[PDB]
């Protein structure tokens, strides 16, 4: 579900930020308070492993939830989707507003086992 997605992501965020250089709540406010608690700007890269096996309703809600971090001025978010079927399959499994959000800055990178032989 989305709650476990956010909790695991925030535990990973706090663990990495503590490992580089007081407990916190593992929700998006840690993203809000990251500059106060660590003194640095934040760049999160989300790597969604095996996207063609995930529940697309959960993934859509998690992306819409991650959209709320855009107003915090010190956070930038990158998303990586590992697609194994086709882009058009994951297009029809997501909401059209989510597609319009993803369309603002996206690139395709094709690396199969024999891309160009």
Partner 1 sequence: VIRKFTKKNVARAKKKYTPFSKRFKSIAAIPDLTSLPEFYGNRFENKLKTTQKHQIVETIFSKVKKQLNSSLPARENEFASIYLSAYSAIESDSATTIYVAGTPGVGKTLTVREVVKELLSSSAQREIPDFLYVEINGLKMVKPTDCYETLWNKVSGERLTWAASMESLEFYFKRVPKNKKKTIVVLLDELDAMVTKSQDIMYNFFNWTTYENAKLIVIAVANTMDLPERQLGNKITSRIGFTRIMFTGYTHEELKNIIDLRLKGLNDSFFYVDTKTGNAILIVRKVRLRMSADAIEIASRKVASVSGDARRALKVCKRAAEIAEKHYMAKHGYGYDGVQTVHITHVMKALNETLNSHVITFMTRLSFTAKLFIYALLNLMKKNGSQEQELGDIVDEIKLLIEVNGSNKFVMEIAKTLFQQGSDNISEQLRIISWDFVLNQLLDAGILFKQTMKNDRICCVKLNISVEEAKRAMNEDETLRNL
Partner 2 sequence: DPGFGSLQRRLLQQLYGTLPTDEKIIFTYLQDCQQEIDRIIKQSIIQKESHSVILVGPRQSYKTYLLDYELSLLQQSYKEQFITIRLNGFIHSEQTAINGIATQLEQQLQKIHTISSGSLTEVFEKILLLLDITKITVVFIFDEIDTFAGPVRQTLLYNLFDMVEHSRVPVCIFGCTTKLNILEYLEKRVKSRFSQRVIYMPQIQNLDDMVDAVRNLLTVRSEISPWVSQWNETLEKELSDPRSNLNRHIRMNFETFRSLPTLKNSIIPLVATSKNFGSLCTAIKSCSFLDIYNKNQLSNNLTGRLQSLSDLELAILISAARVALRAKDGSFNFNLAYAEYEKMIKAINSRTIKLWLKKDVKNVWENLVQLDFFTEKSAVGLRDNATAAFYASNYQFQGTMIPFDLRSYQMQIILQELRRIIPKSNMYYSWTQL
Partner 3 sequence: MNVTTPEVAFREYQTNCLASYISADPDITPSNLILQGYSGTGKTYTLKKYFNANPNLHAVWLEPVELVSWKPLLQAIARTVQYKLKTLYPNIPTTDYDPLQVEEPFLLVKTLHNIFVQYESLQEKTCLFLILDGFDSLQDLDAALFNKYIKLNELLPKDS
Contact criterion met (CB below 8 Å) for 46 and 80: yes
Rounded to the nearest 10 degrees, how much is the dihedral formed by the CA atoms of 101, 67, 4, 45?
Answer: 80
Contact call for residue 92 and partner 2 (CB under 8 A)? yes
DSSP class of residue 75 equals: E
**Residue 28's CB: how many other CB atoms inside 10 A?**
17
Smallest distance from the beta carbon of 10 to partner 1, in angstroms?
A: 11
- Determine which residue in the list 37, 42, 79, 93 makes contact with partner 2, applying CB under 8 A: 93
Q: Could you give the CA distance from residue 101 to residue 112 in angstroms, rounded to a whole number?
A: 26
- Determine which residue in the list 15, 25, 84, 89 makes contact with partner 3, applying CB under 8 A: 25
Contact call for residue 57 and partner 1 (CB under 8 A)? no
Contact call for residue 57 and partner 2 (CB under 8 A)? yes
Contact call for residue 97 and partner 1 (CB under 8 A)? no
**Residue 62's CB: how many other CB atoms inside 10 A?**
22
Could you tell me which stretch among 8-16, 31-39, 40-48, 78-86 binds partner 1 (CB under 8 A)? 8-16
Size of the chain, expressed as the number of residues it contains: 117
Point out which residues bind partner 1 (CB under 8 A): 11, 14-15, 18, 23
């Amino acid at each position: 579900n989305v709650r476990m997605m956010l909790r695991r992501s925030m535990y990973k965020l706090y663990s990495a930020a503590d490992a580089e250089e007081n407990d916190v709540s593992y929700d998006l406010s840690l993203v809000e308070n990251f500059k106060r608690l660590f003194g640095k700007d934040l760049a999160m890269v989300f790597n969604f492993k095996d996207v063609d096996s995930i529940n697309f309703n959960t993934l859509d809600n998690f992306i819409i939830l991650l959209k709320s971090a855009f107003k915090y001025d010190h956070v930038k978010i990158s998303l990586i989707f590992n697609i194994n079927t086709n882009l058009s399959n994951i297009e029809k499994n997501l909401r059209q507003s989510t597609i319009r959000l993803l369309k603002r800055n996206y690139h395709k990178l094709d690396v199969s086992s024999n891309k160009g032989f």
